[PDB]
């Protein structure tokens, strides 16, 4: 009965509170304490995952309390296979991002000496609020945390960043908050509809009850209202997890923010968009999702190819990785909205693999960018000679983001592509071209940077490119280790994800299409 889920999200926020409250002189102690809180949250995640039985009921570790009955929302947490997977992703990443951004806040001034403490506390608050969103089984609670986590990252981008930090932070927050406010419109519409229907005792936000009612058919509502509410949810989840048209904010912010914070935005937080698409959009609005399924599928595939192309066209390392993440988000959304067990399971595993892979690749690029203070690709050359280990890890990460079977991401992309073929073969081929496009923007980048004659000031002067330090080794090794393990033996993660995907597909009245042959 222990509040495992509640503690899981509480610990990061309380840790941020303690950290920001430390004396400025305890900066080193602040770093260590933040790392310790992250590790404690990861241990909580470990116990939650171990106790979770994917063969058991859909929702586990369910904690329920009354929070705001006037709004029909209660503090209800419960972790399913998909939420468990993303929770494990967030937990494993956050300590690594902390030890990745160890010195990121050193060169800041002001904040009464709390710049390091502010950085770490903001990171912890983001981690905890993302966790709260993931394990929240209350629509309004989830929206609360989903929208609010924009603010800690808005600060984390604006402070602790490059020259365009102000502009990129504003664009990020405004895009995402406009989406969130559209989802607030949709949330209030959903509350009104539930209040207008006899299926519920009163206007309700309990996700489980609403899902059960819509599945049981009792909660019968006009398809027009459902379409509009679905669109409201979709706009916010699309701007959050960048669906092609709305991606525009992510490139700048990822470029401007410090690499650890940018990875925290992309690998962890942006996932919450697709997560919502998987949990709410499909399981609240099955008929609307089906009706809009072709258009969203088209948008996701176009996003895949479009992000791949733009990454190809990027002169900037960080912008290239951001567009690569956009294309991978296109993959995730495509796999989620194809409503195929292969598709949804592959897209969940793809959220995991893309989180880890982008984290590794982007952090390696961030170290390289730190060594020489230029983000321009042409500013480098022959780095493979000076920093062999940096180049090796960068190549491994690229291979991961390249969807090579020897690494994790392939297992997912494949699964998604397979899923897309059973319902939209043209779209499946259109996305499969991204296998080629990924090779392009990955290997061309590595060629321009690591190979060729060593560029000026690369191995000499005041800005040489020194190899990876031990701390960067600690950051990098676990990520590549997970990539290898999940590529070789995804069986545990897939076994966790599949029951949740099957539950979802049963919920929305969809099934994997039968093979052509009888």
């Amino acid at each position: 009965t222990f509040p495992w889920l509640t503690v899981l999200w509480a610990v990061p926020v309380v840790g941020a509170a303690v950290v920001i409250l430390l004396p400025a002189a305890q900066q080193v102690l602040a770093k260590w304490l933040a790392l310790a809180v992250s590790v404690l949250t990861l241990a909580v995640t470990a116990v939650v995952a171990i106790g979770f039985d994917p063969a058991a009921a859909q929702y586990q570790f369910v904690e329920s309390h009354r929070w705001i009955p006037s709004f029909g929302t209660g503090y209800i947490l419960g972790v399913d296979g998909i939420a468990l997977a993303l929770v494990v992703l967030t937990a494993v990443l956050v300590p690594l991002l902390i030890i990745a951004g160890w010195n990121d806040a050193s060169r800041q001034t002001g904040l009464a000496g709390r710049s390091v403490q502010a950085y770490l506390a903001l990171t912890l608050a983001v981690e905890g609020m993302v966790l709260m969103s993931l394990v929240a089984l209350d629509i309004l609670l989830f929206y609360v945390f989903f929208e609010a986590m924009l603010i800690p990252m808005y600060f984390l981008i604006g402070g602790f960043g490059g020259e365009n930090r102000s502009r990129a932070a504003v664009k990020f927050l405004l895009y995402n908050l406009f989406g969130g406010l559209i989802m607030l419109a949709a949330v209030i519409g959903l509350y009104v509809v539930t209040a207008g229907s006899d299926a519920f005792a009163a206007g309700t936000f309990d996700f489980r009850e609403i899902v059960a009612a819509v599945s049981s058919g009792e909660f019968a509502v006009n398809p027009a209202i459902m379409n509009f509410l679905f669109l409201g949810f979709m706009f916010a989840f699309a701007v959050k997890a960048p669906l092609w048209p709305f991606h525009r904010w992510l490139p700048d912010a990822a470029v401007e923010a410090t690499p650890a914070s940018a990875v925290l935005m992309m690998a962890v937080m942006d996932k919450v968009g697709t997560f919502g698409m998987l949990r709410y959009c499909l399981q609240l609005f099955p008929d609307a999702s089906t009706y809009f399924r072709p258009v969203v599928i088209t948008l996701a595939a176009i996003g895949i190819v479009y992000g791949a192309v733009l990454a190809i066209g990027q002169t900037d390392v960080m912008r290239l990785i951001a567009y690569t993440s956009i294309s991978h988000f296109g993959f995730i959304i495509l796999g989620i909205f194809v409503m195929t067990s292969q598709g949804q399971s592959g897209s969940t595993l793809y959220m995991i693999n893309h989180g880890i892979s982008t984290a590794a690749l982007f952090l390696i690029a961030g170290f390289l960018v730190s060594r020489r203070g230029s983000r321009l690709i042409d500013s480098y050359g022959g780095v493979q000679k000076v920093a062999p280990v940096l180049a090796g890890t960068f190549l491994v990460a690229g291979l991961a983001t390249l969807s090579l079977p020897g690494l994790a991401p392939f297992i997912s992309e494949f699964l998604v592509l397979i899923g897309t073929f059973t319902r939209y073969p043209v779209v499946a081929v259109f996305a499969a071209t991204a296998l080629v496009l990924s090779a392009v923007y990955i290997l061309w980048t590595y060629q321009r940077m690591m190979t060729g004659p060593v560029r000026d000031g690369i191995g000499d002067g005041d800005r040489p490119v020194r190899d990876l330090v031990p701390r960067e080794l600690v950051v990098v090794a676990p990520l590549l280790a997970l990539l290898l393990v999940l590529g070789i033996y995804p069986k545990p993660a897939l076994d966790v994800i599949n029951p949740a995907v099957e539950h979802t597909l049963t919920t929305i009245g969809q099934t994997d299409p039968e093979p052509t042959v009888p």
Partner: protein, 518 residues
């Protein structure tokens, strides 16, 4: 003979008797002892008023409410809620008003941090004004005037007939007309603000009284319940009822500051003393909206189909013009003024609900928003130019948060609350009003309010950008903490804005229990 419910009328009676006693202190107390007594007499009185209200709340536990003076005053749950809110906001406002100068080397410390000119009758910058400042004299008459305003604003929600509302409107307005012209610096601007507010307030009150005349003509009575019986009974002149409702609405909308009638607020809030700005922006909004709730939920419910379409448009305009005009405003005080303009429309949405959820949401919105606005204006008062003038140009605020992380964080909390980001009372508040509007059939207003809030988040966020994401300029304004009274106001206000956002069910149950008028 008439029966006077003294126990009921206790809060207003206490405030008005305290105001009279304060005028006595001015009349027959020596100079040096006036301020210590007034701030003693005022604050205690309001605290007593607060106490009275809670007992009155206990008194109305069984019955829904009661009239007091043979009509003309009805203490019901909404009335006691609004009176308690106004009492708390008045306590905070008087703690701001009583703040004296930061005695540096001389004993001329005289109620200057309150921003009140030592002798308002003197020509600004005259040798007489300078000599008064050197001698450290203060026009303590401010304390009674403020109290009188509160008295009126206490009654104006509780007035149960047109004559009492009109008298209370004048009683609260005249003190504010006078107070707006007493600022310590930029005396020209304060005097202009006082003149504008007087002229436009007199205009609006003339409309208010003429509408009261039309309502009386239609109904044959001016007790609100009698007007409701007439309009519902169909016996009165429907056209006169409508015209009177419209003309009365003109005055009440001026008081709250709807876009057709908002033009005063920018100038008045800019030029008025920052303390008085903070006090009024909460108290007058609360009192005016309470009266408008009473008129639209007691006096004239039956004509909803007749006045709903009007408020709709107003609300629309209020949210749009109020927010858009703020997007490109460059002065912090004026930006907060336009923010108040927009939040008036946000309130009006939940008033348009015309359902009990409308009343509950409106009461919560007024409480939380009044507190937040008072805190934000107090903070804006703490920031000083090198010359002492309250630095309000946004450019001078660059890096203000970095130089003062605590005040920066508190002000950012207030801004996020105004934007309505979750975890702040401002979210819960806007959510409640929007939910009432949607449940009441006014979903389109919820959508327009969503869009308006999305637009307003930009100007709310640019200020946080200036505080934290920019390095302080060469001449950055310093933070003057004049006295522990202002600190207490800021702390209480921010703590309320945060707690009432995280765990709002306290005071939200009280808002619900105040959903019905007598």
């Amino acid at each position: 003979t008439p029966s006077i419910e003294y126990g009921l009328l206790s809060p207003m009676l206490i405030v008005f008797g305290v105001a009279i006693a304060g005028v006595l202190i001015e009349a027959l107390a020596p100079r040096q002892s006036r301020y210590p007594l007034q701030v003693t007499l005022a604050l205690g009185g309001l605290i007593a008023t607060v106490v009275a209200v809670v007992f009155v709340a206990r008194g109305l536990s069984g019955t829904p409410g009661r009239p007091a003076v043979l009509g003309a005053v009805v203490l019901d749950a909404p009335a006691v809620f609004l009176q308690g809110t106004i009492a708390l906001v008045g306590i905070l406002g008087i703690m701001l008003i009583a703040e004296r100068q930061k005695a540096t080397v001389s004993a001329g410390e005289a109620r200057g941090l309150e921003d009140f000119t030592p002798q308002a009758s003197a020509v600004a910058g005259s040798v007489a004004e300078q000599l008064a400042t050197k001698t450290g004299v203060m026009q303590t008459e401010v304390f009674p005037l403020t109290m009188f305003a509160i008295g009126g604003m206490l009654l104006f929600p509780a007035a149960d007939d047109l004559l009492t509302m009109f008298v209370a409107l004048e009683v609260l307005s005249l003190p504010l007309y006078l107070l707006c012209g007493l600022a310590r610096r930029r005396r020209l601007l304060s005097q202009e603000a006082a003149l504008k507010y007087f002229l436009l307030g007199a205009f609006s009150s003339a409309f208010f009284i003429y509408g009261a005349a039309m309502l009386y003509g239609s109904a044959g009575t001016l007790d609100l319940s009698g007007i409701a019986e007439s309009v519902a009974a169909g016996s009165g002149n429907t056209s006169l009822a409508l015209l009177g409702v419209a003309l009365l609405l003109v005055g009440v909308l001026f008081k709250v500051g709807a876009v057709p009638f908002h033009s005063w607020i920018p100038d008045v809030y800019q030029g008025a003393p920052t303390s008085i700005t903070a006090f009024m922006a909460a108290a007058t909004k609360i009192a005016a909206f309470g009266a408008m709730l009473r008129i639209f939920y007691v006096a004239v419910p039956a004509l909803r189909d007749d006045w709903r379409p009007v408020l709709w448009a107003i609300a629309i305009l209020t949210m749009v013009v109020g927010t858009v005009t703020a997007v490109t405003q460059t002065d912090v005080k004026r930006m907060l003024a336009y923010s108040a303009v927009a939040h008036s429309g946000f309130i009006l949405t939940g008033v348009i609900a015309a359902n009990p959820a409308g009343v509950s949401s409106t009461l919560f919105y007024l409480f939380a928003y009044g507190f937040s606005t008072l805190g934000a204006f107090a903070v804006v008062g703490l920031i000083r130019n090198a010359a002492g003038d309250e630095e309000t140009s946004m450019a001078q605020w660059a890096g203000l948060g970095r130089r003062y992380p605590i005040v920066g964080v508190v002000f950012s909390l207030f801004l996020l609350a105004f934007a309505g980001i979750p975890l702040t009372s401002g979210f819960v508040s806007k959510f409640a009003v929007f939910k009432a509007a949607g449940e009441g059939g006014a979903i389109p207003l919820v959508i327009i309010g969503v869009i308006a809030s999305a637009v307003a988040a930009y100007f709310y966020v640019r200020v946080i950008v200036l505080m934290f994401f920019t390095e302080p300029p060469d001449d950055a304004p310093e933070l003057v903490v004049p006295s522990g009274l202002s600190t207490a106001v800021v702390t209480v206000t921010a703590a309320v804005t945060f707690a009432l956002g995280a765990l709002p069910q306290p005071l939200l149950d009280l808002a619900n229990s105040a959903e019905t008028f007598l």
